[PDB]
Design a binder for this molecule. Structure first.
Ligand SMILES: Cc1cc(N2CCNCC2)nc(C)n1
Ligand SMILES: Cc1cc(N2CCNCC2)nc(C)n1
Lengths: 268, 269
């Protein structure tokens, strides 16, 4: 992988592995989300971010700050087959004092055709108190260094899906998968649950018949609170409709919301 | 990746990813086991095996046969760091009518030093009845075409660890992790639980303090029966021992049917 000519974006090629694919021998949406995180990390390292797993700037380290995910939105047109090479291009953008965005474009290396796109929103948080905050003027100046200064959006369309408000699922849910717990493979190098695990947990309450007859087209996931290493999660799903679903992840005990989201599926 | 000059082994290089590493920023043993499976699959494809996820020969497809894992044994000297390149060499051998073996050597691409080694034993099974069987004359002939004919072993030593008998853990276990269930990410393209998931489940009952202060050196895992997509597993561990040694048992949480047994050896960091 490498920064592009202008140094304002990063590209990397990946060969889809045997264990990364589902029953149709194409990459799972979790494999895709893992690849987006990997190219995101390689980009951060190439533009001088910390190498501890937190990907922080020098101002952030001094102020005890870290970025946390607020939302992930992915739209796939074609999932790459086992053995195929997929090229992913990524870049970041400052969104005033609200937070930052990381965008991605996926392409078929052989054809050059766009096969998918993704966007993520990140908010600043104090690492110690776990309190959210606004982006300071010094952090906005650090992002000007490596981000395009004119807008560059993976999802440009006004009023598009990636920015839509997600409602809260009302009990009773149509479908559910209860007592989901993370194991060591679900944790990152800092012992926090990997963001991709929550996508897997959302998908667990989708009936196997939908997965067998449909392809996932779009997934939008809001992140509200973290699942700790010793927490247990319930995954809830209700059909709102193509097939469309509304999702809710909450802690099994007290029912505290951890995530909410929606999925859009197309009949194969 | 590619077959070596003689066409009797296969090599591939891997760059260790951000999500593949643990707290010490080196690859987990599950990442290593995933890489061994991946280079194994690329070798099978290069020597003309099926491309359906079962990796079968022509004779096996005609006879409705598949290979199943009987044992996995891995010894790591150094786990590669995040961003490091690891080169893995793999080859197979026919073991008469008993079954077949796949061996692996891991090396640091920069230094060329051996950082780990692994061996696996596979037994023939009828895909329909799920009954184990011996390897037929025709399957042994298919293996002669791509396997070295003189013995080549990752673990050559006399009565080495890789072939040791593993006893059954007696209740009560010292440690346990109850109610483990596979999710879709744990399944392979054929909707069976991935062999690496069982390594993860064995390790779940090791206390976090051992993981925080020790490095896993050797893991030996026997495979007896499969965990189905709707099964639930309990993971049991008892200390048997500068080094820490454990005995492991995975069983179905309902009836207590054994699915795996194994041992781990750990060294204080
Ligand atoms: C993952 C996450 C956590 C979080 N916090 C954590 C606890 N303090 C307030 C809320 N906020 C967001 C947007 N995402
Ligand atoms: C060695 C072995 C045997 C096996 N059996 C054999 C009896 N019928 C069910 C399948 N399954 C596995 C995963 N490994």
């Amino acid at each position: 992988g490498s920064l592009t000519e202008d140094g304002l974006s990063y590209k990397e090629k990946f060969v889809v592995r045997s264990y990364e694919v589902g029953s149709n021998k194409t990459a799972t949406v979790e494999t895709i989300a893992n690849l987006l995180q990997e190219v995101g990390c390689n980009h951060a390292q190439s533009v001088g971010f910390s190498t501890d797993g937190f990907a922080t700037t020098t101002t952030m380290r001094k102020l005890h700050l870290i970025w946390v995910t607020a939302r992930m939105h992915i739209e796939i047109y074609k999932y790459p087959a086992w053995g195929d090479v997929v090229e992913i291009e990524t870049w970041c953008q400052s969104e005033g004092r609200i937070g930052t965005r990381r965008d991605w474009i996926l392409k078929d290396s052989v054809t050059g055709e766009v096969t998918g796109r993704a966007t993520s929103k990140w908010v600043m948080m104090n690492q110690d108190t776990r309190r959210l905050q606004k982006v300071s003027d010094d952090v906005r100046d650090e992002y000007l260094v490596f981000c395009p200064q004119e807008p560059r959006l993976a999802f440009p369309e006004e009023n598009n899906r990636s920015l839509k408000k997600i409602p809260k699922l009302e009990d009773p849910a149509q479908y559910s998968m209860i007592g989901l717990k993370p194991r060591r493979a679900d944790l990152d190098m800092n012992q926090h649950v990997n963001n991709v695990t929550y996508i897997g947990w959302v998908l667990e309450s989708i009936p196997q018949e939908i997965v067998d007859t449909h392809e996932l087209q779009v997934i939008t996931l809001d992140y509200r609170r973290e699942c700790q290493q010793d927490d247990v999660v319930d995954s809830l799903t209700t059909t709102t409709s193509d097939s469309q679903f509304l999702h809710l992840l909450r802690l099994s005990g007290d029912g505290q919301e951890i995530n909410r989201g929606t999925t859009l599926w197309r009949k194969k």
